[PDB]
Amino acid sequence: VVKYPVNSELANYAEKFWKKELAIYNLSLILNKMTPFVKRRSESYKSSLSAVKEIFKNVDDFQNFLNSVLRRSLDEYRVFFENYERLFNSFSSKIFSMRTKSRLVVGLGDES
RNA sequence: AUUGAAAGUUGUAGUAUGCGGUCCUUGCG
User: Fold this and answer.
1) What is the C-alpha separation between A61 and A54, in angstroms, rounded?
2) CB burial of residue A38 (10 Å; 0-12, 13-18, 19+)
3) CB burial readout A96-107, b (16+ within 10 A) else e
4) Which nucleotide is nearest to A111 (CA to C1')?
5) CA–CA separation, A98 vs A44, rounded Å?
6) Residues whose CB falls within 7 A of nucleic chain B?
7) How far is the CA of A33 from the C1' of B14 (A)?
8) How far apart are CA A97 and CA A99, in angstroms?
């Protein structure tokens, strides 16, 4: 039971897309607006990330779907990055690059 | 049968010139 709290036509469109049938590219749009409420048996329609993972075939499957959706915007991200680097160089700013020692999370407490 | 009868405070004329809602601050234990 993946009933959505959105008007019926967008509800069925989101249902169609959610089962890896379409190629919606804005990951934020999928996550924020068309939220897949899950009503697993013997329980009300919860909305936690655990239920969302239960909707997908496996945790790896959900991770792959998210990675694909994120990677789908590569060209736009590249153009934006070129503009950003041009801005950095234009203002005469020192730029460097590091890497994450371990896992990172910023703004975990943002309310959703 | 009177210091009386008579006479448009009226014409033109831009509340206008200058000015950054800005500074400080980890969404987190």
Assistant:
1) 11
2) buried
3) eeeeeeeeeeee
4) B27
5) 45
6) A 106-111
7) 54
8) 7
